[PDB]
Design a protein around this ligand. Sequence first.
Ligand SMILES: */C=C\C(=O)Nc1ccccc1Nc1ncc2c(n1)N(CCc1ccc(NC(=O)C=C)cc1)C(=O)N(c1cc(OC)cc(OC)c1)C2
Length: 296
Amino acid sequence: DLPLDPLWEFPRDRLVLGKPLGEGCFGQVVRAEAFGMDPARPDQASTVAVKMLKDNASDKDLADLVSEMEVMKLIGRHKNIINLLGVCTQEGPLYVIVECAAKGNLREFLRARRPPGPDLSPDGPRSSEGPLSFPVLVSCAYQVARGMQYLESRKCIHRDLAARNVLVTEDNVMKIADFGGVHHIDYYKKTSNGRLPVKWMAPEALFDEVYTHQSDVWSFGILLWEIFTLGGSPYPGIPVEELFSLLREGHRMDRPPHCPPELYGLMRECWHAAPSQRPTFKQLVEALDKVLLAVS
Ligand SMILES: */C=C\C(=O)Nc1ccccc1Nc1ncc2c(n1)N(CCc1ccc(NC(=O)C=C)cc1)C(=O)N(c1cc(OC)cc(OC)c1)C2
């Protein structure tokens, strides 16, 4: 079976499975109620997210989920990542119980909060004020950088860092998801929501199958661009075939509208050809911290 880990094992009868949250990478994820996740409050309800094997899963799918579980045990706890809460490995299906972020992923969060165009009638003194302000976008960027910096300190490379893979809590805290098959990537693969994940890959990863923390920094720069386009799709209108040759030529995305040169500056730094010429996550946290303090 699977060994028992009393440090993490949670009785499965203390879960009530609820609404499916969609296809997770290695299985499906369901919202759930947990009673007594805090052992000091055994009858207290909390909302959690539960990852489990899809129907008719292989022995490989089990291996993947179990390895994701073991990664999460190892990396420890941080404010800006999805944290492991517990597991159900005994006498029933494998459950991996993690934090549930009320507002969904960062890309959807941004796209849903785009400002009103000059389309609707002025109603109220804030008719043109959108939900999102510059300091809060910078805070989103800063928090992801702090999460990535933690992950890096734990020798963890993400390899798909993208806004879709950051979740947003009720208090607008960013939590990096799915930090733990690079030899088979379909670079033409479009996800069911229309995403082309090749557009987040560093040149060395895409061309040479090399991943480092500086590869993630490249992706971070793409995520920066998503934020300051409020959830835009990178390399707009560029199909994958054209992306290959544009990247070989050293092409980079344009500065987006309503983005200050400080932030487009950091994006271009993240996309320097040589990985040693990109900022480290520690440098990105510091740089974003300066902008955040300057504007708060
Ligand atoms: C809490 C109320 C709620 O339901 N919120 C909600 C509504 C709709 C969508 C998403 C959420 N909130 C939420 N919160 C935490 C987690 C998740 N969702 N999911 C599902 C969404 C998701 C995120 C990232 C995905 N990655 C990729 O597609 C590619 C990398 C896919 C789907 C979720 O999967 N998790 C989750 C995260 C991790 O990160 C380590 C690990 C696990 O299981 C081990 C699950 C959390």
